[PDB]
């Protein structure tokens, strides 16, 4: 299910590898997905295919910039 990344790491090294790099990998693909989906849908309502997203953690960044 999970992948055992980090064999020769001590308690703190391994703590920081898992928790930091998993949070960063998640929010990378997460924020990317949220905005990419919003982009394509709003320009033209297209037939969406696949996304691994499931449990939402109240996440939005719906802001606007004066057009210049």
């Amino acid at each position: 299910m999970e992948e055992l990344s980090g064999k020769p790491l001590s308690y703190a090294e391994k703590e920081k590898l898992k928790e930091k790099l998993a949070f960063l990998k998640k929010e990378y693909s997460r924020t990317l997905a949220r905005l990419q989906r919003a982009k394509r849908a709003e320009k033209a309502k297209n037939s969406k295919k696949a996304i691994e997203d499931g449990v939402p953690q109240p996440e939005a960044l719906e802001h606007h910039h004066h057009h210049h």
Partner: protein, 60 residues
Amino acid sequence: MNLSEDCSQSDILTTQQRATMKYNLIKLQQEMAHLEAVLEQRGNQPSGHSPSLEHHHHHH
């Protein structure tokens, strides 16, 4: 394509959300490659990044 004719594709994901998504994915990918590199090669010794999220529990 027929059903989806478009639109104003320049600003849809807003110019604010453009600079936003750039600086977001930038900090996320820089901390990805650089912090891992420093951690697995040098043991997180010269960085020592314990931010504040030390809430790493599963079964106490």
